Amino acid sequence: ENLYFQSNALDKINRYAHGFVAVPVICACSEAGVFELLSQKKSLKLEEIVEHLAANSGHLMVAMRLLESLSFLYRSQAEEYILTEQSQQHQIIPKALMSLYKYPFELYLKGEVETGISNWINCSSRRWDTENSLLSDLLDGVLLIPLLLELKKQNLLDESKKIFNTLTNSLKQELSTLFINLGWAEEKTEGLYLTDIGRFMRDRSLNLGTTASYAPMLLQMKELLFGNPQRVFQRNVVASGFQHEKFFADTDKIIISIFNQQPIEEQPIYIVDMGCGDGTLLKRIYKIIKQFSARGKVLTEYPIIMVGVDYNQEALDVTDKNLVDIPHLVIPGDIGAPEKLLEQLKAQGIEPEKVLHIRSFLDHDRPFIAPKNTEIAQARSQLDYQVVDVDREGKLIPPHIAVQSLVEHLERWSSIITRHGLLLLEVHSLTPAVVKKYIDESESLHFDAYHAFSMQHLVEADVFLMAAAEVGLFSRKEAFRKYPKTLPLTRITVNHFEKRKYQIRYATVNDIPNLLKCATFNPPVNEPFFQVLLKQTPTAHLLLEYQGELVAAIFTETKNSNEVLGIREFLVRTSVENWQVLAKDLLEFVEQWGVVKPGIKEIEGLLKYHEAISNFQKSKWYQS
């Protein structure tokens, strides 16, 4: 899809979805006095703004991260929010624009309400009286998402006969002016027709329905930020509405490769899908195995049994019927109760050693279970995670608590995973620093806000991989993929996790005594330098740990305005058996971790230190 359609169509729709979420957040903060407060106090931490405004810290934090990403707020290193030169743009947003989130567009297009949208069309033609091109697009999105969705639902952009000509003259004049102003239609000599851009708005699948369904919650943004969120939440795969489904083609390829492994008898027998839904992913994998893999030539001799697992009983039945001509079973289960799933499998003679676990876009939707390792959870408060996670009351869950929860969740899975591993797709959030640079290219701004508001559990891609590594789960380099492919940001990982005998975790001050005993490729580093290095970037330095032994550590730094990740130390404990393979594993992980680290465009040092350990032959290493 070419460059002209990228910037004049795709980017436009993405900005409209941005505005659809961002304009309600800005208005609710604007009306509550957030920018007035920050204009009086110069700078405030989240908990201070919460106190002054009696806010819900969780949802307000979502809002703060959105405002920072749009440059409406600056956030200092001490984590105080500060006004910016763009803050004052909140005054450009007409207060009454929020009424569109309850405007019956369906009745408007049928001529059944006299109150129309005529001044919002004129606002749009005046580009909302601002010179900020992006703001004009955020504001258009409030009108255009619901209107275009409704236009398409009533087939009013169909181009046989003419466009709009079945409407009343005033309705057809309003909409012709809007579509001409937008560049979506032009008056040719015989009539009015769509342009290439308007035809793109009509024909391409743009997730309009998904974005428009954010509306009932966005209507209640004031209640969510400053009132009672339990009033807001009163009374078959949404996440796979991205801009493509390349990741299922990747899953296809990974699957084929698993079931091309030789000899056949070492392949899995059961494919257990957590969150089976309507059996779609299972049916798709079974047909792929049949038509394209070696195993598909011998399904009579070596059966494959598809297993759908889901916590909703109705989903089991739709799955059980949709897989009627496929050897399958249907079992109730919950992600986050994998030990119960294993007890269930074993109660039907399914040996765990014969199982390949799969799931798509589900760990972020698990029921949150609070950390049970109280001590380990506390020790994690020294790290510096940016995770935003909201609880039943609208309060902010402390980032180390949210990550500890994730780690204990992956530890439960880690203990039932077998030699066949765990095929796992997941969606990930971004940091405000990165969303800032890629507002047009990435959906993060509205998606991360909407899903955090919804009390779901997104983390940054590198946090997710580190949480898996802490529990012995490693995304096989042969299968790994990240999207988007060509931007220094990661919204989707495609993973084939395997269980390994070691763990990789972040190094801490407590690791210094064993760091001091390591051989090292650069001049050895003393206690105080380790103290500084670790306190200033507590999530920059990784170690590989095996049965308690420090085997290796790598120290990194992020430079070139946060685009280049560089390696600055490599420590090995050469007394440890197989340290050379283990050190090379740690290095391979650092490469994957760097590929998904938000903002990182390239990595420096991977050839240098792989060579040093590859041909270690020369103890030109300090301390043996």
Ligand X SMILES: Nc1ncnc2c1ncn2[C@@H]1O[C@H](CSCC[C@H](N)C(=O)O)[C@@H](O)[C@H]1O
**Interface residue list for ligand X (CB under 6 A):** 236-239, 274-275, 277, 310-312, 315, 334-335, 360-362, 365-367
Rounded Cα–Cα distance for residues 73 and 83 (Å): 5
Looking at beta carbons only, is 277 or 394 nearer to ligand X? 277
Q: Which one-letter DSSP state was computed for residue 397? A: P
Least separation, in Å, of the C-beta of 274 and ligand X? Answer: 6
Q: What are phi and psi of 82, to 5 degrees?
A: -135, 140
Can you say whether the dihedral through the CA atoms of 537, 538, 540, 543 is positive or negative? positive
> Least distance in Å: CB of 368 to ligand X?
11
- Determine contact, residues 20/446, Cβ cutoff 8 Å: yes
Shorter beta-carbon distance to ligand X: residue 366 or 610: 366
Q: In the complex, what is the shortest distance from the CB of residue 310 to ligand X, in angstroms, rounded to a whole number? A: 5
Of 366 and 505, the one with the shorter C-beta distance to ligand X is 366
Q: Is residue 154 part of an annotated ligand binding site?
A: no
CB closer to ligand X, 457 vs 541: 457
Residue 451, marked binder: yes
CA distance 117 to 537: 52
397 known member of a binding site: no
- Which burial class, exposed, middle or buried, applies to 328 when counting CB atoms under 10 A from its CB (0-12, 13-18, 19+)? buried
Distance of alpha carbon 139 from alpha carbon 149, whole angstroms: 16
Q: How far is the CB of 336 from ligand X (least distance, A)?
A: 7
Q: For the residues of 105-117, what is the DSSP string, one character each? A: HHHHHTT--S--S
Shorter beta-carbon distance to ligand X: residue 67 or 274 = 274
The least distance separating ligand X from the CB of residue 281, rounded to whole angstroms, comes to 8
**Cβ-based nearer residue to ligand X, 17 or 341:** 341
- For the CB of residue 110, give the shortest distance to ligand X in the complex, in Å: 33
Pick between residue 143 and residue 272 the one whose CB is nearest to ligand X: 272
The SS3 of residue 156 is coil
By CB atoms closer than 10 A (0-12, 13-18, 19+), residue 504 is buried
Name 553's bridge partners: 543, 571
Minimal distance, residue 424 CB to ligand X, in Å? 12
335 is in an annotated binding site: yes
DSSP code of residue 425? E
- What is the distance between the alpha carbons of residues 436 and 216, in angstroms, rounded to a whole number? 27
CB atoms within 10 A of CB 610: 16
Whether the CB-CB separation of 52 and 446 falls below 8 Å is answered with: no
Angle value at C-alpha 52, between 47 and 57, nearest 5 degrees: 35
- CB burial readout 467-493, b (16+ within 10 A) else e: bbbbbbbbbeeebbbbbbeeebbbbbb
CB nearer to ligand X: give 298 or 369: 369
Kindly state the smallest distance separating residue 564's Cβ from ligand X, in Å.
Answer: 34
Output the smallest distance, CB 360 to ligand X, in A. Answer: 6
**Nearer Cβ to ligand X (267/456):** 456
Residue 622 labelled as part of a binding site:
no
Comparison of 246 and 436: residue with beta carbon closer to ligand X: 246
Q: How far is the CB of 318 from ligand X (least distance, A)?
A: 9
With CA atoms as reference, report the closest residue to 456 among 360, 359, 365: 365
DSSP string, 235-294: ---STT-SS--HHHHHHHHHHHHHTT-SSGGGS-SEEEEES-TTSHHHHHHHHHHHHHSG
Q: Measured from the CB of residue 470, what is the shortest distance to ligand X in angstroms?
A: 22
**Which CA distances in Å does 208 have to 89, 109, 454, 483, 492?**
26, 18, 19, 21, 20
Q: Does 344 carry a binding-site annotation? A: no
- Give one DSSP letter per residue of 37-61, joined into a string: HHHHHSEEEHHHHHHHHT--HHHHH
For ligand X, the closer CB: 100 or 315? 315
**Smallest separation, CB 345 to ligand X (Å):** 15
Nearer to ligand X, 423 or 512 (CB): 423
496 annotated to a ligand binding site: no
Q: 564 pairs with which residues across the strands?
A: 559, 602
**Which helix (H) or strand (E) is 29 found in, with range?**
helix 11-32
Q: Which residue is at the shortest CB distance from ligand X?
A: 275
Q: Annotated binding residue at 360? A: yes
Give the CA angle between residues 281, 282, 288 to the nearest 5°. 90
User: In which element (H, E) is residue 13 found?
Assistant: helix 11-32
User: Which candidate, 523, 529, 579, 530, places its Cα nearest to that of 550?
Assistant: 579
Residue 244 counted as an annotated binding residue? yes
Fill in the amino acid letter for 59: H
Q: C-beta of 601: minimal distance to ligand X in Å?
A: 30
Q: Which CB sits closer to ligand X, 203 or 317?
A: 317
Q: Distances in Å between the alpha carbon of 82 and those of 34, 238, 256, 439? A: 11, 35, 52, 21
Binding residues: 244, 310-311, 334-335, 360, 364, 451, 456
Residue set of the binding site for S-adenosyl-L-methionine: 244, 310-311, 334-335, 360
Annotated binding-site residues for S-adenosyl-L-homocysteine read 244, 310-311, 334-335, 360
Q: Report the binding-site residues for Mn(2+).
A: 364, 451, 456
